[PDB]
From a paper:
The PRV capsid, similar to other herpesviruses, has a triangulation (T) number of 16 and is composed of major capsid proteins (MCPs), small capsid proteins (SCPs), and triplexes. The triplexes, each composed of one VP19C protein (Tri1, encoded by UL38) and two VP23 proteins (Tri2, encoded by UL18), anchor to the capsid floor via Tri1 N-anchor.
Here, we use cryo-EM to image both the PRV empty capsid resulted from abortive DNA packing (A-capsid) and mature capsids fully packed with DNA (C-capsid). Based on our localized reconstruction of the C-capsid 5-fold sub-particle, an atomic model of PRV CATC was built; however, only the N-terminus of the pUL25 subunits (upper pUL25 aa 1-73; lower pUL25 aa10-83) could be built out as α-helices; the remaining C-terminal globular domain, in contrast, was disordered and failed to be modeled. A comparison of the penton and portal vertexes also revealed a slight difference (~6°) in the orientations of the bound CATCs; such discrepancies may influence their interactions with the triplexes underneath. Indeed, we observed that the peri-portal Triplex Ta rotates counterclockwise by ~120° when compared to peri-penton Ta.
Author numbering:
A (entry chain s): 1 to 148, 168 to 296
B (entry chain g): 691 to 739
C (entry chain p), J (entry chain m): 3 to 50
D (entry chain g): 1036 to 1054, 1056 to 1323
E (entry chain w): 494 to 542
F (entry chain g): 51 to 326, 337 to 444
G (entry chain h): 24 to 82, 94 to 340, 348 to 368
H (entry chain o): 1 to 296
The structure:
């Protein structure tokens, strides 16, 4: 399948600028075979949180050719996992070989191929490696939680992010989880005889600030402490949650980079082969 | 360690190192107050009366 | 490793897995295994 | 020499794949073999270009290394971190996922080296640093001395029959300086340790059955260091060709240095003045 | 916390790339410090403004 | 436009440093070997101790596997034009097809070239790793036969420790003398040993006796050598222009297929056991000592205008050591002259206190000193 | 082309001569480990061996056709019950359907949910049967009609789903969208009220790549009445002690009681405030579980046409992993 | 895209052992048509967390036929049409037909090839069905945790079933299970406690609501629309001037926790790498025996 | 970014970060006299411009 | 297993025991070892 | 990469202040002048013919 995006008549002042966008990704809404350019288009920059929430509700598409009439595309993932294509990087950090990439809305705006003749503008999302996209989502959601190079939130959707976060956190509290919660001092004392044990604990740990301020008594034996065991259940639940906490706030990694011959690290603004996942 | 820097820096600023000759209890009364390291002095077997 | 030109044909067939005792090595692969088609030799190039 | 290598080239082959486009990737297998008893080639290292790395200073920071049990009063080592990491580059900035030294901006000269510090009694004789010396004092190495000489102390130091050692805190088995720069004591960090090869016997598995083996091994030993803006540790697999006669002698050279700038002036003159001393330059780089 | 002005800063360790004095030391005839956003002189107790 | 400087590996003088033979079935052979036998001579002693028998010994050296490769990507927009699928019936698509096929030809022309400079680079990569430095090589050859007891080994290492630190940089620390350079080159050329003779080399001078070796350098050192110390011998040399061949046929085949080995000169062994075009290339020669070697600096003919570093700029590595705060004993502090670095009158002399820093010159020369407080990164840590 | 799976099995649940090709089949876990994991998985207060009994009351058999499973649930249109009963050849079939219903209702009661007991295979196309022993064959990837059935009346096939269970979403949620390529999800609906509970099945199609909030709103009544009646039979203690209030005023207190690191023992640690987080009987996550879904593939079109059915259109088999829906 | 690996010739006998591992998986570094065996090697006594983190920055590849000269691999990430391939199951328990496999390090007692002739070791990761792996990880971690607090060291219920047969879960001291897993249990338990503490600090009165009518009502209101009981998160107290030695900004701690939790969740596998589509064979493959698989 | 920040050390004498706290920070004294976009330009030439 | 026909002669001699590190495997003996005299083969005597 | 340009500019800084005047600082080294002239000639590159 090859999504076909039709174009209206264009002035030569912007057609030649659109030609340069040969390896960026756009977000359709329905996967019909044909679709006009006006359809696939997002308003000018605003509320990076809302936009990041919108990328979840639509499936991406990367474009390959730009003819004076017609502009092709490719629906990224609907049935395929090995359609090796090429897409250019537009994020600040240079993405290296091996790691996955995730789509993130742009910061500060200023990335808008404002077309005057057609009277519309596009905002192609930037591409970041997973390790840094996670951190960016963390920073933005924390800042949203603060309000009860950086744009301010809107207080209408930030509450939705807070709701998702607080739900995913609330459902960690289990009658088994308290058993683990009981050994905070037994953990700190273990984080003293060795080096790695102390290394795993952070500095503003938000728990060392607790284990040295409050004593907790032995836990109450739960109902039927003979038949079943609770710590196992709580830990399994926590694995199940944390395996899917990153995506529920940001976006799943959409493709991983593979290059057969070129230099490993590809700089910003340069195309690099890829395979999707 | 509930002690100003000077006592950690030098060795003779400590209020916990008793002098070799004492005529009263003024140094000893100051000693026990630093429980951040469990101190103890043994006088013939009794703590002090 | 396998033969190239058989010398004598066998007149009488029999179940072979019964008489494992008569033979010293025994290998019975299902059908067309992977080892038969390896032509990998090794030898000295020159001496001096 | 006239025929120093046999060279066999195989048969080319063209493997295809898909990547947008079409990647034809040629390949040709080939092999060679030395065919001369004894050596058949040599090089001399005639000229000299600028030192590719800076020869400055950079105090190594341990706080990137783990395995050392911390101090009980967490406020104490919190203060240690808060004061020693201050104003010190290659400090382990806790930027996401790595807690590694941040990418520095701007380079005076080649990649900056790293410095170490080894405790030593004040009454160590000074003349041990004029000639080429070993930072331990036991000058064991391997080339001059059979196995068992690296940590024994009932046998004299071969390079100084006078004493047994020259640095008690840096020679004994399980000594202090050993427990920081050894091979099998799991106290290494991401930063390169310029003295890693001086306190390591793990080559005991690699016993030397000929001086020619060490000779040929030197001059082509793969590089242990990185090539970024610092001297980071590098995976051993990649490597690169580099020459170093140190690992053959385990000995170091003293650079031109003195305990006062007022001694290193164009009228050099005296080399020992008072408590302040001067060490002439006895190294392979006399010019 | 200790006031930076009273406890001397450093001789060399002032020009280190981290300390919080270079950010406020950029004219030989003027000083720059932080102060409560009030009018001077003000009331006795230091307001948390 | 621009041409494409083609180069053939056999024209270069580096060829005389190796024998090259195609072996079209290398992709099949497991680890191959080569067998030497050598018979050391012996001289007759006399007297009390009994004589000895002449010794014999064999040996083998195994091969090693390397490979070359190069990418050749072409794109879809032109792939549709080559195969004629995307071809249209016009007078304009024809020209784009012409352009596409010319591009593919000018591309394959470059990729086929790379398999010559490939060997040109691989030979240097190989030879550079088996040649020990000359410094560590001369005295060891001076001490042959006596490296049995320990004391001779000590007398050898005590001389290696000097040769490393004194004979390591000529023509940069000796620019007034001439015959010292040529004599060092003579030692270099004469310290090795000739390898096996083969009739396939025939690398000859324009007039007479054959060549013996090569001398590869960087352009700068070659320039410094060809105008003060070395006189050009000639300007041509007749070389072979064909490879050799080792093939498996009609006697190696039966053995390789049924047994599992196949010796190269199998036909000779058989027929004994049972009864039974020189080219001209402009290379630049030079005579040194009593031999005759090629003198090249391949930085231009090859390796030029590309992205690979020249493998002849190696890397020396030294480890410096300086004492920080030592205090000399009492009986060694003394001013060489009573007129000392006398400090300012009225104030006491800080030249008596124990020193607490070292001063050393940096790469360029501006001094940068290390003081105790820099050791805080070490002497302030729980590891202590 | 597409890839197939063959699994010889017993003719109890999926009966490949009774139905024609083109309907999804499921793989049933070995029941031994379910019965075992119950022993540790059933919540407090409830029975801890009732699944053992429910299984023992139904006595390898491995596959189960969705056409069969949909009948043994709450939601079903009785026409399909009549079809399964009178159209299956097999003996004792209605009784078995009843027992299977009791099995699934026990599964949800014991907090070992059936979505952890039924992996999904593709749509069957072929079979050879002995007397009460079959070998079904289903696609696993690619599109359905790349196969080749040995019917010789209709070589290719399609995908048939009982229209009684097919719940569309977009036209349901009124997204105002326009039907293009839509995903396909098989969803389960749990409901938990002790001794009065059931399971609802559906087959959902939409353009929504992430169900989540969509089901959370679709099944609002289920989540509501499941979060409150779910903790039942668990002895909660009396009114929570005031010590349970985790003190927050004490974090950035400059003057407060403090403890030297490494000394939580007998030495003077008494002056620290006590806090007993005690959570015994509140709603855990498994208590608020109400639905679970898994992606099936992509679809063009759905038409309804005959017993009512729902023929798919260009189904491309792409099976995904299971998913929880509790929040 | 099939890569070959140069093999430095070892010996007889050992090469047979290398031939026996004709089905396992190996983690390459970069997709080049050549590689040395020295590259794909890991010290078979190693930290499980770091190995599981490194498994992401590599490519999976299965060892097809081997010869004294070289061995051939086939990567799994990139590929055309997802062709079939054979795989040697090496987990502790069998895997059925029609499920998904995942790659986890040798969590329990380890097995590692010791190629004493070449002086290098190899680790071949386990091959587990999805849910059973996600539960086995929790099993080992929970056992270590129960041991940590010095409580009842045994409960006789550290067992896992799979297709009838009961598995024993070998004792946790065999190779280095008390040392090569400490990192994992620490890094997991700590994060769990930190998440709990942050939540309770943002909502101080959560555990003082109705035991059955308040907490459930709060959760159901939170899951539903925007009531939220006002700022259900009470305004935390104002922090210190960030030089006081006891500064605690809760929101930055929440930020760090989000980041670390996401990172830990991604470095755990649990995203299927293949799917068994066995055909013309016994429907249940026992451990140690090959099994036809199609990559996902 | 190397010219006005004071966390990355001086790339010529990496000991300190700057060698003059009165001429290196932005808006310093010595800067407000010879900066191109603060416009205190007179008729005479300025070598340090 | 010595060579029967050497391909080419070695030009130069050298003390080889000192340079032994260049070679992979080798062996020296006094003179005229008995091992390299008897050479016995192993033959398969008919395939079927 | 940075490590190359570092040494490049560090050698440029030395090449400026040593070889900006010949045949006025060095009339004794007659051959050094011809050396420098040969360098000057060969350093350039031929254009299209």
């Amino acid at each position: 399948m090859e999504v076909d995006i039709a174009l209206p008549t264009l002035s030569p002042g912007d057609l030649s600028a659109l030609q340069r966008c040969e390896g960026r990704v756009v977000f359709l809404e329905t996967l019909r075979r044909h679709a006009t350019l006006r359809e696939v288009a997002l308003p000018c920059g605003g509320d990076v949180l809302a936009a990041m929430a919108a990328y979840r509700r639509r499936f991406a598409a990367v474009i390959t050719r730009v003819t004076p009439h017609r502009m092709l595309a490719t629906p990224l993932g609907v049935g395929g996992r090995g359609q090796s294509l090429v897409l250019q990087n537009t994020g600040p950090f240079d993405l290296t070989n091996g790691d996955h990439v995730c789509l993130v809305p742009p910061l500060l705006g200023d990335e808008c191929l404002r077309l005057t003749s057609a009277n519309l503008e596009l905002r192609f999302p930037m591409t970041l490696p997973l390790a840094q996209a996670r951190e960016l989502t963390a920073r933005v959601v924390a800042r949203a939680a603060e309000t009860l190079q950086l744009p301010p939130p809107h207080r209408d959707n930030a509450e939705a992010a807070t709701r998702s976060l607080v739900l995913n956190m609330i459902f960690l509290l289990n009658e088994g989880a308290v058993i683990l919660l009981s050994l905070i001092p037994n953990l700190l004392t273990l984080g003293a005889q060795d080096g790695y044990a102390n290394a795993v604990i952070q500095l503003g740990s938000a728990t060392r600030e607790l284990g040295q301020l409050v004593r907790q008594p032995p836990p109450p034996l739960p109902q039927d402490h003979a038949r079943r065991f609770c710590v196992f259940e709580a830990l399994e639940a926590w694995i199940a949650s944390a395996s899917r906490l990153g995506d529920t706030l940001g976006t799943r990694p959409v493709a991983r980079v593979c290059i057969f011959d070129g230099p490993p690290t590809v700089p910003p603004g340069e195309k690099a082969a890829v395979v999707e996942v | 360690g509930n002690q100003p820097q000077e006592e950690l820096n030098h060795a003779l600023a400590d209020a916990t190192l008793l002098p070799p000759l004492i005529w009263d209890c003024d140094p000893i009364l100051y000693r026990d107050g630093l429980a951040e390291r469990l101190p103890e002095l043994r006088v013939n077997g009794a703590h002090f009366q | 490793r396998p033969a190239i030109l058989p010398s004598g044909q066998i007149l009488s067939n029999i179940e072979v897995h019964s008489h494992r005792a008569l033979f010293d090595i025994f290998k019975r692969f299902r059908s067309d295994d992977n080892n038969l088609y390896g032509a990998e030799f090794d030898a000295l190039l020159g001496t001096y | 020499e006239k025929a120093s290598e046999s060279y066999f080239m195989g048969q080319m082959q063209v493997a295809r794949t898909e990547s947008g486009g079409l990647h034809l990737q040629l390949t040709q297998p080939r092999a060679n073999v030395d065919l001369g008893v004894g050596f058949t080639a040599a090089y001399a290292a005639a000229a000299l270009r600028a030192p590719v790395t800076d020869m400055g200073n950079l105090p190594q920071n341990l706080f990137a290394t783990r395995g050392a049990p911390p101090m009980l009063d967490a406020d104490a080592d919190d203060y240690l971190r808060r004061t020693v990491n201050a104003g010190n580059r290659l400090a382990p900035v806790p930027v996401f996922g790595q807690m590694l030294p941040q990418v520095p901006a701007g380079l005076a000269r080649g990649q900056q080296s790293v410095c170490e510090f080894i405790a030593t009694p004040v009454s160590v004789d000074l003349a041990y640093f004029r000639r080429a010396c070993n930072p331990r004092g036991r000058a064991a190495g391997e080339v001059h001395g059979e196995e068992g000489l690296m940590f024994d102390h009932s046998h004299a130091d071969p390079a100084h029959p006078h004493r047994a050692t020259a640095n008690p805190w840096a020679s004994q088995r399980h000594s202090y300086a050993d427990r920081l720069y050894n091979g099998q004591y799991n106290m290494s960090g991401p930063a390169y340790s310029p003295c890693f090869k001086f306190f390591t016997p793990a080559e005991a598995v690699a016993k030397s059955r000929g001086l020619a083996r060490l000779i040929a091994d030197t001059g082509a030993a793969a590089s242990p260091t990185s090539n970024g803006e610092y001297q980071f540790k590098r995976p051993v697999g990649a490597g690169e060709l580099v020459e170093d006669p140190c690992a053959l002698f385990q000995e170091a050279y003293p650079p031109l240095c003195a305990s006062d700038s007022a001694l290193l002036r164009t009228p050099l003159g005296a080399e020992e003045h008072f408590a302040q001393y001067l060490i002439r330059d006895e190294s392979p780089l006399k010019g | 916390v200790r006031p930076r002005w009273a406890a001397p800063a450093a001789a060399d360790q002032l020009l280190a790339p981290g300390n919080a004095d270079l950010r406020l030391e950029l004219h030989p005839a003027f000083d720059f410090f932080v102060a409560p956003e009030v009018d001077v002189p003000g009331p006795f107790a230091v307001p948390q403004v | 436009c621009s041409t494409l400087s083609l180069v053939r590996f056999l024209e270069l003088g580096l060829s005389v440093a190796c024998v090259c033979t195609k072996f079209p079935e290398l992709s099949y052979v497991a680890e191959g070997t080569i067998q030497f036998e050598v018979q050391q001579p012996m001289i007759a002693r006399d007297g009390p101790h009994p004589a000895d028998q002449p010794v014999h010994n064999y040996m083998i050296k195994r091969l090693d596997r390397r490979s070359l490769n190069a990418a050749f990507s072409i794109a879809v927009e032109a792939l549709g034009l080559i195969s004629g699928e995307n071809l249209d019936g016009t007078h304009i698509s024809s020209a784009m097809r012409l352009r596409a096929i010319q591009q593919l030809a000018r591309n394959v022309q470059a990729v086929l070239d790379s398999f010559e400079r490939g060997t040109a680079d691989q030979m240097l990569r190989v030879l550079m790793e088996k040649a020990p430095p000359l410094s560590l090589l001369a005295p060891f050859t001076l001490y042959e036969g006596r490296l049995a007891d320990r004391v001779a080994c000590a007398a050898l290492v005590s001389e290696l420790k000097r040769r490393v630190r004194d004979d390591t940089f000529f023509l940069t620390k000796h620019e007034r003398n001439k015959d010292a350079v040529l004599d060092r080159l003579s030692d270099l050329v004469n310290c090795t040993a000739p390898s096996v003779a083969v009739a396939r080399m025939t690398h000859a001078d324009t007039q007479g006796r054959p060549v013996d070796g090569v001398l590869v350098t960087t352009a700068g050192v070659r320039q410094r050598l060809l105008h003060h110390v070395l006189t050009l011998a000639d300007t041509h040399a007749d070389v072979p222009v064909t490879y050799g061949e080792m093939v498996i046929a009609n006697t190696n085949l039966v053995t390789a297929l049924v047994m599992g080995k196949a010796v190269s000169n199998m036909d000779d062994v058989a027929r004994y056991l049972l009864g039974g075009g020189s080219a001209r290339v402009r290379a630049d020669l030079v005579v040194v000592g009593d031999r005759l070697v090629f003198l090249e600096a391949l930085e231009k003919r090859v390796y030029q205008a590309t992205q690979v570093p020249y493998p002849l700029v190696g890397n020396l590595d030294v480890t410096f050591v300086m004492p920080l705060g030592v205090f000399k004993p009492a009986a060694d502090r003394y001013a060489r002259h009573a007129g000392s670095f006398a400090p300012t009158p009225g104030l006491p002399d800080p030249r008596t206190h124990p020193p607490r820093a070292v001063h050393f010159f940096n790469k360029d020369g501006v001094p940068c000193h290390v003081t105790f407080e820099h050791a805080m990164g070490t002497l302030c840590h729980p590891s202590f | 082309r597409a890839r197939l799976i063959r699994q010889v099995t017993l003719a109890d649940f999926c009966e490949p001569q009774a139905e024609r090709p083109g309907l999804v089949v499921l793989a049933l876990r070995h029941p031994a480990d379910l019965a075992g994991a119950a022993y540790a998985a059933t919540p407090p207060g409830k029975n801890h061996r009732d699944l053992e009994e429910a299984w023992l009351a139904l006595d390898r058999a491995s596959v189960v056709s969705l056409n069969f499973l949909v009948a043994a649930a709450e939601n079903a249109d009785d026409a399909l019950r009549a079809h399964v009963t009178t159209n299956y050849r097999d003996r004792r079939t209605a009784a078995r359907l009843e027992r299977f219903a009791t099995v699934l209702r026990a599964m949800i009661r014991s907090h070992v949910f059936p979505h952890r007991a039924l992996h999904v295979l593709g749509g069957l196309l072929g079979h050879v049967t002995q007397d009460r022993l079959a070998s079904v064959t289903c696609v696993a990837r690619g599109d359905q009609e790349a196969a080749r059935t040995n019917d010789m009346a209709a070589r290719r096939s399609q995908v048939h789903v009982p229209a009684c269970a097919l719940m569309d979403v977009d036209r349901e949620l009124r997204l105002g969208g326009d039907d293009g390529l839509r995903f396909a999800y098989l969803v389960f609906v749990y409901t938990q009220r002790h001794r009065r509970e059931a399971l609802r099945v559906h087959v959902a199609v939409s353009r929504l790549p992430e169900l989540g909030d969509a089901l959370s709103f679709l099944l609002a009544g289920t989540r509501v009445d499941n979060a409150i009646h779910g903790t039942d039979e668990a002895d909660a203690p009396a009114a929570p002690a005031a010590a349970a209030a985790f003190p927050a005023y004490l974090f950035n207190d400059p003057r407060s009681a403090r403890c030297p690191t490494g000394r939580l023992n007998t030495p003077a640690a008494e002056a620290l405030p006590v806090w007993a987080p005690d959570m015994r009987g509140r709603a855990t996550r498994n208590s608020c579980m109400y639905a679970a879904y898994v992606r099936l593939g992509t679809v063009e079109r759905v038409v309804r046409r005959a017993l009512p059915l729902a023929h798919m259109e260009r189904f491309t088999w792409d099976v995904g992993a299971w998913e929880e829906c509790f929040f």
